[PDB]
C-alpha cells in the first residue's frame, strides 16, 4: 500500500482519437451524463436592439441527458514474487530490494491499467465514429445503446450500386466518391485514414497513385503525431489536397488479438470535430471524502487484511465519451 | 478536513521536498493575508538585530602569538573602516543598489525564517564611488531548482549538485520571474571558492542529515487559517439569526375532510373554488393592508407557514476553545500571544518578568544561531577584500598567513538589539552588583549594555574635564 | 464572504501589483471613513517625530583623519545653518510653498506608512528669500505608472524603468489629477544623479527582492470593515425587535366545516355572506373603537393573525468575539487598542510599564527604520548645496573630497520625539544610576533626554553664575 | 481505540524492536505535523547547550603526579587550540562540510532525544585548510539494520553484531536513501578501535540490560494526536450546528382517512389527484414566492418535514478534560505547558521560582547525562590527534603514557548554556552570600556564572588600570 501521489507516468499516447477529436472532457460530481447540463454549442447569433437588452441565455437544454458512463474499475496484484521487466543493466541490486521491485511493479501494473482503459476507450471511439451507436454493455449489466444520432447519409455504403472492386483498376478515380461522401459531412474532410485493405483497394486505382503526393509537404502537426505514435497510425502521404493515413491498431482480447478496425470502413470528417469525454461518479470512499468524485482517473495501492490478506493496485474511472456532431462524419463500408 | 492537507509517513526531508511548492505557496498566502506573520517577523527583527548589528573583530591573538594591544589597534582600524563602509547613505552596497547592510541582514533573516535558508552572493561591483569593489546580492529561493525544473535526481537534488557523501558543490539558479513573463534558465553557481572565498553564502538550518532546505510556516498554520474561517462564519451566522423572523399568515379554515375534498375536487375539475378563495384572500390583504412594521408582510394566503424550529441551544464554547488554542499555538510558534495580540488578562509580576526573561534569552538563542553565520560570512568577504586592497595592516608576526587562518584572523562577534529594558530596578540592581563585585568584564558588560568600554571611558574623561572647566560637579 | 476579496497564490509582489488599484482604493475608503487610521498615523507621528526631528552631523573624523574638535566646530556651524534654514516661518521650503521641514517629514512618513513608499524630488527653487536655492517637492504615488497606464512590461514595470538586474533607473510620473479633469502625461525622472546627487529620493521598504512598492493597510482591514458592519446591523435589529408587537384581532367563530362551507359558497356564488360579515365587523370596530394605547389597532377582521415565533434565543456572544478580535488585530496592526480606544479593564502595574516599554522600543525601531532614510537624504542634498555655496567650511585636511565621501562627510543621526515620561520613578532611578556609575555618555544621554550636553553645561554655568550674583543657591 | 496501537506484554526491548519502524515513523509524522516537538527540542537545545558548549581540560594532576600549574598551563594551550579549531567559519569541521561544532552537538542531542541514540564517526579528512585531519560525520539511525534488512538473529541483532555477553563489536550501516531511490548496502563499522580510539561513537541511554536502542516519543504522543483530532472535530460540529435550520413547508390538509384513501387511490389508478395537487402547490410557490430571507425556501410541497430533534445538551466538559490532560502530559513528557504554550493562569511567586529552579536543575541533569558523553568522546579524539601532531606538549613527568591514560589525561568537563536569570534578587543575594562566606570556588563559581576566573581577574586588572589612567573610579 503506497500513497496516491505514486501515480506518475507522463505517458499519454492515445491513438489520435481521445487527444485530437475528443479533447472535450467533462468529469462530473454526478452519476450519469446530462447533455442538457453540458453547454455544448451555445445559442450563438441573436443580438438586442440599441435601446435595452434581452432575456437570459442558458445552456440550451439538450433533449437527451441520461446515459450510463462506463464505470471501469479493474485491479491487479503487485506481489513481490516475480522477476520484473529489467531495463538493461540499471543495477539489479535495487530489483533485489522488495521496495524498488514493489514500486516499479506498481508502476508497471498501473500503466497496464490506464492503457487498458485507453484501449477500451478507443474501441468505444471506433464504435462511436463508425456507426454513431455505442454499446454500454457488460455481464451483470443491462446493455444501453448510447446514440449520438448518426444519420443515414452518414451510413451510406460503397458496395451499394457500383463497388470500387467492381471498377476499372486503372482509369476509375474514387475522388468523385470522395467528394460525394464528403459533401454530406457538415464540414470539410482533411484526413482519409483507412483500414489497411481499404487503403489497398483505394490505391489500387492508378489515378490515386499518380494523384497522391508521397512527399512530406508538412501540412500540420499530424506528422508530429505520427512520429510520436509510430506504432499503428501510418502517414501514407499527401493525396494532394487531403492527407492519407492508415490505422492498423489492434486490441489483444481475452484469448486472441484482432484489429480495432473492421474489414473495409471509412469516416469522412474534420480533424477538429467536437468530442465529449463526460465522466461519471467515482465510487471510492477515498475519492468522495477527498473530492475526486469529479475527475478523470483514480489509482490506489492498498492492503487487504483477512481472507485475501494481500496487497493490490486498483484503478477506477467512468468514461462515456461521445461525439457532439454524429453528422460530422460519414461512415462508409467499402468494396 | 485532513483531506486538503496530507502528511506522508517518511523522513522529513523526503516528506517536505515533494510538496515543497504547495506548502511554500500556501505559506505565502497566509503571510500575505494574515497579520501574524508580519508581527512575528517584525518582532524577530527588533529582537535579533533591532537598531543595528555591530561588528567586533577579535583575532586569536593568544593562539596566533599576536599581541593583544596590536590586535586591539588593528581591530580599531578595521572597525572604523567597516563602519564607514557600511554607513553608505546612497544604498549602494547592494547590486540592486537599494539596500544597505541593515536590509541585507533584514531580508536575509526574514527569508531564513520563512524558507529556513538564505542565499547571498559575493559579486564584484564596478561602481567606483567606494574603495571596496565587492557587493553582496541576495538570491531568491525560487531560483534553486534542478536544471529546467526537472525532478530530484541521483546527485542533482532540488537544484543542488552534491556528491554521494552529500557535499554541496553548486547550484542551478533559475532565471528571475519578474515580470511574470520571463522564462527560467538555470545557471551554475558553486557554493564557495577553493581558496576559502565565500562566493555563494548558503546559510540554512538542517533539521537532519542530508536535508537541503529549511523549515516552513504554513505546515503548522493551516489550523489558524481554518479556525479563523470557522469563528468568522459562526459569528456571521449567529449575528444574522439572532432575530430572523418568519412573517406568514395562517387561518382557522382547515376543515380536515372538507378541505381535503375541496383540494381533490379542485385538482380534478373544480379549480374555480381555489380561484375564488385566492381572489377572496387577495381582496382580504388589499382591504386589510396586512402590514407588520415599516415593511409589508410577505403575501401568504392561509394554510402555509414556515417551521423555523432550531437546533441545540447550548453555549458555543468557542470562548475557551479559542483561548486554549491561542495559548496552544502561541508558545508553539514561539512568541507568546499575550503580546502577539497583547492580552492583559490576569497577568502578574512574576508572570511578566519570567516570561520576558525566558523569551528574551530565547531570542538571544535565535540571534546567535541565525545571525552570526551571515555576519561572519560577510565580514570574512569584506576583510579579504580589505587585505587585497591593503586598507588595514595585518600583524607582521603573523604565525599563519591570512589565506590560511581566515577563521583565526577573521574571528569576530556581533551585537544585536540595544539595551534591554523591562523593569528598571532589575537591571540597575544587577548593574550595581556587577560593578561592585567585579563580576562583569569589558566584553560581557558591553554585551549587556549595548555600548563600548573604550568610548564610555573616553566620554567619561570628557565629562569630568568639561564639568571641571565649566564649573560642574564630576 | 471570500468572494468580494480574493488572494492569488503567488509571490507577494505579483500578488499585489495586479490588484494595486483596488486594494489602495479600498484602503483610501477605510482611512477616510474610519477613525482608526487617523489615530494610528497620529500616534506614529507623535512617537517617531513628535515635536521635531533634530539633525546631528558626525563626520567620520577618526577614519578621515579629521580632528574631533574641528569636526565638532564644523558640526556647530552646519547645525546653526540647518536650524536657521529649517525654521523658515513662511512655509517657503517647499515648491508648493505650504509645508516646512516638519510637514515634509509628516507627509513623507504618512505616505510611506500608507503605501509603503515616499517620493521626494530635489528641485531648484528660484525664490531668493533664502540663501539656498534647493527645495524638495513630494511626488504622489498615483503618478508612478507605466507611460500611458500601460500594464507591466519587461523592464518598464508599474512605472519604474529598470534593467534585467532590477536596478531602478528612472520613473514615469503621470500628470496630476487635481482638478479631477486633468489628463495624465508621463514624464521621465531618474532616481539619482550619477555624481551621487539625490534627485528623486524613492524610499520604500521591500518585503522581498525585486519588489517595487511598499506595504498596504486595507488588505488586513477588510475584517474590521465587515465586523463593524455586522455588529452595527445586529445591534440595530436587536434594538428594533426587543418590543415589536403584533396587534391583530381573532374571534371564536371558526366552525371548521361550517366556516369552510361558507367560504366555498362565497367563492362560488354566495359572496353576500362575506360582505355581510365584513359589514358587521366594520360596525364592530366602529362601535367598539378597538384601540389599544395611544394608537389605533390595525384593522383585522376575525380569523387572521401573524405568527411572530422567533429563532434561537441564546446570547449573541459578540461580547467575547469582539474583545478577542480587538485584542487580535490590535497587536496585529501593532499599536495596542487599550489605547487605540483606551480600555482600562483590569490593567495593572507590570502590565502598564512592560507594554509601554516594549511598544516604545518598537516605535524606536520604526523611527530608525523609516525616518533616517529621509533625514539623511535631505541632509545630504542640503549639505551639498551648502558646500556649493561655501556656507560652511570643509576641513582642510580632507582625506577624501566632498563628492567622493559624501557618506563619510554627511554622516548624520537624528533625534525624534522628546523626553519619554511613563512612571517618573523609573526614569529618575535610571538617571541617578547612570550619572553615578558613568554608564551614560554625552550622545546616548542626550538621546535619552532629548537635550544637548553642550547647552546643558552652558546653561548650568549661567545658572550657577546667576545664583551667585542674585544671591541664590547654586 | 486500542486497535490502531498495540502494546505486547514483554520486556521493553523486545516489545519495541519488532514495532520499531512503525513507532518511529508515526513519531516522524507527529514531530513534522505538530509544533510541540519543535518547541521541546528547541528548549532542550537552549537549556542544555544554549549559546555554546565550553571545554575545560582537567588532567588528573594529583593522581598522575603532574603539577597543578603545569596542568593548568597545558590546559590553557589545549583550550586555545580547541577554541581556534572549533571556531572555523567555513563550516569545515564536518565531512558534510556544512556543520560546525555547535551543530554537531545540536544534531547529536536532537537525534539522541528523538531515537535515544546518536552515531558519530571519526573520519580522516584530507582538506588541508586546518592542522587537524580528523572530522566527525554523523550517521543516521536508519542505517543500522541487519545486513540486507534481515530480522534479528542470534548475535546480529537489529544491525549490531555482538557476542553472547552482548559486547557491541560492530554495526551494519545501510547505504543512504537520499535521493529516495538509492538501494541500501550494509557496511561493517566497529564500535571502537582496540587502542581505545573512539571511531564509532554510539551514545545511547539503555533503559535495561541488553537494550540496543533509545527511547521514543510517539508511543506516548498518540493521545495528543487523537485528542487534538477530537477537539478539532467537536469544535467544527459545534460551530456548524449552533444555527442549522430546516426550511420546509407543512399544511393543514391531512384528513387522516381521506388522505390515506387518496394516496391509495393514486397508487392504484388515480395518480391524477397527485399530479393536480403537485400542480396546485407549484402554482402556490410560484404565486407566493415563498422566500424566507436572502435565499429561497427549498421546495417542499405540504406533508413532509425534517425532525431535527437533538441529543443531550449538557456542557461538553472538554474544558476541564483538556486542562487536566495538558497538565497531565506536560509534566509527563517533562517540560511544563505553562510555557510549552505559556498560560499565565493564577500563577504565583513561589509557583514561578519553585517550578523554574526544579525544571532548570532537571535540565542540568539531562545536560550532564546526554551531553558529556559526546563532549568527552570528541575531546578525546581531538586530543589524540593533537598529541599525534605535537600541537600541545604532554607533561614530561607523565606517570602513565597518553595511550594508557587517555581517560586520566583527557579528563574534561563542559559548560552548557549561559548565566541563568529568573528573579535577579535571588541570584544577587546568592552571589553576595557566596562571595562573603567564601562558600564558592573558582570552578563552581564559573559554573554558576558562565565565565572564567582567570579572565575576570585579568579584565578587572585592566578595569582598575584604565580607570586609574583615564581618571575614573576603580
Swiss-Prot record, chain A:
Keywords: Capsid protein, Host cytoplasm, Late protein, T=7 icosahedral capsid protein, Virion. Gene3D superfamilies: capsid protein of prophage domain (3.30.1930.10), putative capsid protein of prophage domain like (3.15.30.10). GO terms for cellular component: host cell cytoplasm; T=7 icosahedral viral capsid; viral capsid. It is found in: Virion; Host cytoplasm. Its main location: virion. Pfam families: Phage_cap_E (PF03864). The keyword Cell membrane does not apply. Belongs to the lambda phage major capsid protein family. Assembles to form an icosahedral capsid with a T=7 symmetry. The icosahedral capsid is about 60 nm in diameter and composed of 415 major capsid proteins. The assembly is primed by the interaction between capsid assembly protease and portal dodecamer, and major capsid proteins assemble cooperatively to form the procapsid with the help of capsid scaffolding protein. Major capsid protein forms hexons and pentons of the icosahedron. Viral genomic DNA is packaged into the procapsid through the portal vertex. Homomultimer. Interacts with FI protein. This is Major capsid protein. It comes from Escherichia phage lambda.
Curated annotation (Swiss-Prot), chains B, C, D:
One of its GO terms (molecular function) is structural molecule activity. Proteolytically cleaved by the viral protease during capsid maturation. Keywords: Capsid protein, DNA-binding, Viral capsid assembly, Viral genome ejection through host cell envelope, Viral genome packaging, Viral long flexible tail ejection system, Viral penetration into host cytoplasm, Viral release from host cell, Virion, Virus entry into host cell. It comes from the Viruses. GO terms for cellular component: viral portal complex. Transmembrane segments: none annotated. Its main location: virion. Coiled coil: none annotated. One of its GO terms (biological process) is virion assembly. It is found in: Virion. Belongs to the siphoviridae portal protein family. Homododecamer. Interacts with the terminase complex composed of two small and one large terminase subunits. Forms the portal vertex of the capsid. This portal plays critical roles in head assembly, genome packaging, neck/tail attachment, and genome ejection. The portal protein multimerizes as a single ring-shaped homododecamer arranged around a central channel. Binds to the terminase subunits to form the packaging machine. This is Portal protein B. The gene is B.
Amino acid at each position: 500500500a503506497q500513497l496516491l501521489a505514486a501515480n506518475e507516468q507522463k505517458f499519454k499516447f492515445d491513438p489520435l482519437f481521445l487527444r485530437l477529436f475528443f479533447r472535450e472532457s467533462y468529469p462530473f460530481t454526478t452519476e450519469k451524463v446530462y447533455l442538457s447540463q453540458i453547454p455544448g454549442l451555445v445559442n450563438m447569433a441573436l443580438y438586442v436592439s440599441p435601446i435595452v437588452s434581452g432575456e437570459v441565455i442558458r445552456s440550451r437544454g439538450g433533449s437527451t441527458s441520461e446515459f450510463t458512463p462506463g464505470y471501469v474499475k479493474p485491479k491487479h496484484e503487485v506481489n513481490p514474487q516475480m522477476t520484473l521487466r529489467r531495463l538493461p543493466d540499471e543495477d539489479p541490486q535495487n530489483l533485489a530490494d522488495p521496495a524498488y521491485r514493489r514500486r516499479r511493479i506498481i508502476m508497471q501494473n498501473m500503466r497496464d491499467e490506464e492503457l487498458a482503459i485507453a484501449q477500451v476507450e478507443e474501441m468505444q471511439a471506433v464504435s462511436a465514429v463508425l456507426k454513431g451507436k455505442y454499446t454500454m454493455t457488460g455481464e451483470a449489466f443491462d446493455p444501453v445503446e448510447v446514440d449520438m444520432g448518426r444519420s443515414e447519409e452518414n451510413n451510406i455504403t460503397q458496395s451499394g450500386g457500383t463497388e470500387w472492386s467492381k471498377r476499372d483498376k486503372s482509369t476509375y478515380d474514387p475522388t468523385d466518391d470522395i467528394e460525394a461522401y464528403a459533401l454530406n459531412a457538415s464540414g470539410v474532410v482533411n484526413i482519409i485514414v483507412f483500414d489497411p485493405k481499404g487503403w489497398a483497394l483505394f490505391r489500387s486505382f492508378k489515378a490515386v497513385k499518380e494523384k497522391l503526393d508521397t512527399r512530406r509537404g508538412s501540412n500540420s502537426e499530424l506528422e508530429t503525431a505520427v512520429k510520436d505514435l509510430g506504432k499503428a497510425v501510418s502517414y501514407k502521404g499527401m493525396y494532394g489536397d487531403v492527407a492519407i493515413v492508415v490505422y492498423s491498431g489492434q486490441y489483444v482480447e481475452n484469448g486472441v488479438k484482432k484489429n480495432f478496425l473492421p474489414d473495409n470502413t471509412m469516416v469522412l470528417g474534420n480533424t477538429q470535430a467536437r468530442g465529449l469525454r463526460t465522466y461519471g461518479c467515482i465510487q471510492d470512499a477515498d475519492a468522495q471524502r477527498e473530492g475526486i468524485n469529479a475527475s478523470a482517473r483514480y489509482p490506489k495501492n492498498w492492503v487487504t487484511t483477512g481472507d485475501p490478506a494481500r496487497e493490490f493496485t486498483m484503478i477506477q474511472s467512468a468514461p462515456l465519451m461521445l461525439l457532439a456532431d454524429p453528422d460530422e462524419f460519414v461512415s462508409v463500408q467499402l468494396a | 478536513q485532513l483531506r486538503s492537507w496530507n502528511p506522508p509517513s517518511e523522513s522529513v526531508d523526503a516528506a517536505l521536498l515533494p510538496n515543497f511548492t504547495r506548502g511554500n505557496a500556501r505559506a505565502d498566502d497566509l503571510v500575505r493575508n494574515n497579520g501574524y506573520a508580519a508581527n512575528a517577523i517584525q518582532l524577530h527583527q527588533d529582537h535579533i538585530v533591532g537598531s543595528f548589528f555591530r561588528l567586533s573583530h577579535r583575532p586569536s591573538w593568544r593562539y596566533l602569538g599576536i599581541g593583544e594591544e596590536e590586535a586591539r589597534a588593528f581591530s580599531r582600524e578595521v572597525e572604523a573602516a567597516w563602519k564607514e563602509f557600511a554607513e553608505d547613505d546612497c544604498c549602494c552596497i547592494d547590486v540592486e543598489r537599494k539596500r544597505t547592510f541593515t536590509m541585507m541582514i533584514r531580508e536575509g533573516v526574514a527569508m531564513h525564517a520563512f524558507n529556513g535558508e538564505l542565499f547571498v552572493q559575493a559579486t564584484w561591483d564596478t561602481s567606483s564611488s567606494r574603495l571596496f569593489r565587492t557587493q553582496f546580492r541576495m538570491v531568491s529561493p525560487k531560483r534553486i531548482s534542478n536544471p529546467n525544473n526537472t525532478g530530484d535526481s541521483r546527485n542533482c537534488r532540488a537544484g543542488v549538485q552534491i556528491n554521494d557523501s552529500g557535499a554541496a558543490l553548486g547550484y542551478y539558479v533559475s532565471e528571475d520571474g519578474y515580470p511574470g513573463w520571463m522564462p527560467q534558465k538555470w545557471t551554475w553557481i558553486p557554493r564557495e571558492l577553493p581558496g576559502g572565498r565565500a562566493s555563494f553564502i548558503h546559510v540554512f538550518e538542517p533539521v537532519e542529515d542530508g536535508q537541503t532546505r529549511g523549515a516552513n510556516v504554513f505546515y503548522s498554520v493551516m489550523e489558524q487559517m481554518k479556525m479563523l474561517d470557522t469563528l468568522q462564519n459562526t459569528q456571521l451566522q449567529s449575528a444574522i439569526v439572532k432575530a430572523m423572523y418568519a412573517a406568514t399568515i395562517e387561518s382557522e379554515l382547515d376543515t380536515q375532510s372538507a378541505m381535503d375534498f375541496i383540494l381533490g375536487a379542485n385538482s380534478q375539475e373544480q379549480r374555480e373554488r381555489l380561484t375564488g378563495w385566492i381572489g377572496e384572500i387577495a381582496a382580504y390583504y388589499a382591504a386589510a393592508p396586512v402590514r407588520l412594521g415599516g415593511a409589508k408582510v410577505p403575501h401568504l394566503m392561509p394554510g402555509d407557514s414556515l417551521n423555523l424550529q432550531t437546533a441545540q441551544d447550548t453555549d458555543n464554547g468557542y470562548s475557551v476553545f479559542e483561548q486554549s488554542l491561542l495559548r496552544y499555538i502561541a508558545a508553539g510558534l514561539g512568541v507568546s500571544y499575550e503580546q502577539l495580540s497583547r492580552n492583559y488578562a490576569q497577568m502578574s509580576y512574576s508572570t511578566a518578568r519570567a516570561s520576558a526573561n525566558e523569551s528574551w534569552a530565547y531570542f538571544m538563542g535565535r540571534r546567535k544561531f541565525v545571525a552570526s553565520r551571515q555576519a561572519s560570512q560577510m565580514f570574512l568577504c569584506w576583510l579579504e577584500e580589505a587585505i587585497v586592497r591593503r586598507v588595514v595592516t595585518l600583524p607582521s608576526k603573523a604565525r599563519f598567513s591570512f589565506q590560511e587562518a581566515r577563521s583565526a584572523w577573521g574571528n569576530c562577534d556581533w551585537i544585536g538589539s540595544g539595551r534591554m529594558a523591562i523593569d528598571g530596578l532589575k537591571e540597575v540592581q544587577e548593574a550595581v552588583m556587577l560593578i561592585e563585585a567585579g563580576l562583569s568584564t569589558y566584553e560581557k558588560e558591553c554585551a549587556k549594555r549595548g555600548d563600548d568600554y573604550q568610548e564610555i571611558f573616553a566620554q567619561q574623561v570628557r565629562e569630568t574635564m568639561e564639568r571641571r572647566a565649566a564649573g560642574l560637579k564630576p
